């Protein structure tokens, strides 16, 4: 029932999901002058060499690439994290215009899109159990700006025609997510939530400072996806982002000076 339209969008979600007005909701605005460098943070460890991608799917709210998480193959460790977090999927949020689309903002600046690489804490055994824990998930968030093409994104964009409508999936094996990463792993981190229903407050957010550049042609392909299912009137999948939520009693920590 929930979505991104006028009658089912973010301002309505609290009725079905009262945690929408909770104490650690995401996304947030990252005020760069107020985020404090934390020298006790460790460098991120992003170990994606053994990643096994499986499928790509249009779920009616985004498109998502899934991974085999039945073994420690592609894992996120270090930084603010205790223990090992397994990559299980990535997806994006994007806009109808280049000046909007990201969920997190930086000094109120919105990027054209935001990539979420979703990982779960292996101490909880499965992702469903992890989402019930305050430290169950770690999401690596990466901003997209429009400029030069990102070569590592092209294989994604070229398959989107085959998953145009809600409910479509396709094989998407042998995709290397290392090609989506910027050079620097400098990051901000804070405790938050999923940015869609169920809005569970289970995420350690790790948002990279350096955006990746993608071309106008790449992002235009995102905007040709459909929220609707096959054999229905086209409603373009655009502006599938939740706006910044109140920071409340939280501090955003920077890994860098």
Ligand X SMILES: O=C1Nc2c(Cl)cccc2S(=O)(=O)N1
Q: Name the minimum Å distance from CB 94 to Zn ion.
A: 11
Q: Is 93 annotated as a binding residue?
A: yes
CA neighbours closer than 13 Å in the CB half-sphere of residue 188: 26
Our finding on whether 104 is near Zn ion (CB under 5 A) is: no
Give which of 241, 202, 205, 218 is closest to 35, Cα–Cα: 205
Using an 8 Å Cβ cutoff, are 148 and 211 in contact?
no
Our finding on whether 116 is near ligand X (CB under 6 A) is: yes
Using an 8 Å Cβ cutoff, are 84 and 213 in contact?
no
Q: Name the minimum Å distance from CB 149 to ligand X.
A: 24
Q: Name the minimum Å distance from CB 90 to Zn ion.
A: 9
Tell me which of Zn ion, ligand X, none is bound by residue 156, counting a contact when its beta carbon lies within the kind-specific cut-off of 5 to 8 angstroms. Answer: none
Our finding on whether 118 is near ligand X (CB under 6 A) is: yes
Which ranges constitute the DSSP H helices of the chain? 13-16, 127-130, 154-159, 216-222
Q: Which residues are catalytic?
A: 61
Q: What is the DSSP string of 136-196?
A: SEEEEEEEEEESS--GGGHHHHHHGGGG-SBT-EEE--S--GGGG--S---EEEEEE--SS
Our finding on whether 139 is near ligand X (CB under 6 A) is: yes
Pick the stretch among 43-51, 150-158, 193-201, 225-233 that binds ligand X (CB under 6 A).
Answer: 193-201
Single residue of 17, 47, 54, 131 touching ligand X by CB under 6 A: 131
Tell me which of ligand X, Zn ion, none is bound by residue 88, counting a contact when its beta carbon lies within the kind-specific cut-off of 5 to 8 angstroms. Answer: ligand X
Alpha-carbon dihedral 90, 94, 100, 104, rounded to 10 degrees = -20
Pairing of strands 75-78, 85-94: antiparallel
Single residue of 28, 35, 46, 194 touching ligand X by CB under 6 A: 194
Pick the stretch among 48-56, 143-151, 190-198, 225-233 that binds ligand X (CB under 6 A).
Answer: 190-198
Our finding on whether 56 is near ligand X (CB under 6 A) is: no
Q: Name the minimum Å distance from CB 42 to ligand X.
A: 22
Pairing of strands 212-214, 137-146: parallel
Q: Is 195 annotated as a binding residue?
A: yes
Give which of 84, 223, 86, 76 is closest to 142, Cα–Cα: 76
Give the C-alpha separation, 194 to 24, whole Å.
10
Pick the stretch among 53-61, 112-120, 130-138, 197-205 that binds Zn ion (CB under 5 A).
Answer: 112-120
Give the C-alpha separation, 225 to 93, whole Å.
12
Single residue of 89, 218, 245, 255 touching ligand X by CB under 6 A: 89
Q: Is 189 annotated as a binding residue?
A: no
Our finding on whether 116 is near Zn ion (CB under 5 A) is: yes
User: Closest-CB residue for Zn ion?
Assistant: 116
How many C-beta neighbours within 10 Å does residue 243 have? 15
- Chain residues binding ligand X by CB under 6 A are 64, 88-89, 116, 118, 127, 131, 137, 139, 194-196
Annotated binding site for substrate: 195-196
């Amino acid at each position: 029932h929930w979505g991104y339209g006028k009658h089912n969008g973010p301002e309505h979600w609290h009725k079905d999901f009262p945690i929408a007005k909770g104490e650690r909701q995401s996304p947030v605005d990252i005020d760069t002058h107020t985020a404090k460098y934390d020298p006790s943070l460790k460098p991120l460890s992003v170990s994606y060499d053994q990643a096994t991608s499986l499928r790509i799917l249009n779920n009616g709210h985004s498109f998502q690439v899934t991974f085999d998480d039945s073994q420690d193959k592609a894992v996120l460790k270090g930084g603010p994290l205790d223990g090992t977090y397994r990559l299980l999927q990535f997806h994006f949020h994007w806009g109808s215009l280049d000046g909007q689309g990201s969920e997190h903002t930086v000094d109120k600046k919105k990027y054209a899109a935001e990539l979420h690489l979703v990982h779960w804490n292996t101490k909880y055994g499965d992702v469903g159990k992890a989402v019930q824990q305050p430290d169950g998930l770690a999401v690596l968030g990466i901003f997209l700006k429009v400029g030069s093409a990102k070569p590592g994104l092209q294989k994604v964009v070229d398959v989107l025609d085959s998953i145009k409508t809600e409910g479509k999936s396709a094989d998407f094996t042998n995709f290397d997510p290392r090609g989506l990463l910027p050079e620097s792993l400098d990051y901000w981190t804070y405790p938050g939530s999923l940015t869609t229903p169920p809005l569970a407050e289970c995420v350690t957010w790790i948002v990279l400072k350096e955006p990746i550049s993608v071309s106008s042609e790449q992002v235009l392909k995102f905007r040709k996806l459909n929220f609707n299912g096959e054999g229905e009137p086209e409603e373009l999948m655009v502006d599938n982002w939740r706006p910044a939520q109140p920071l409340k009693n939280r501090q955003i920590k920077a890994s860098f000076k």
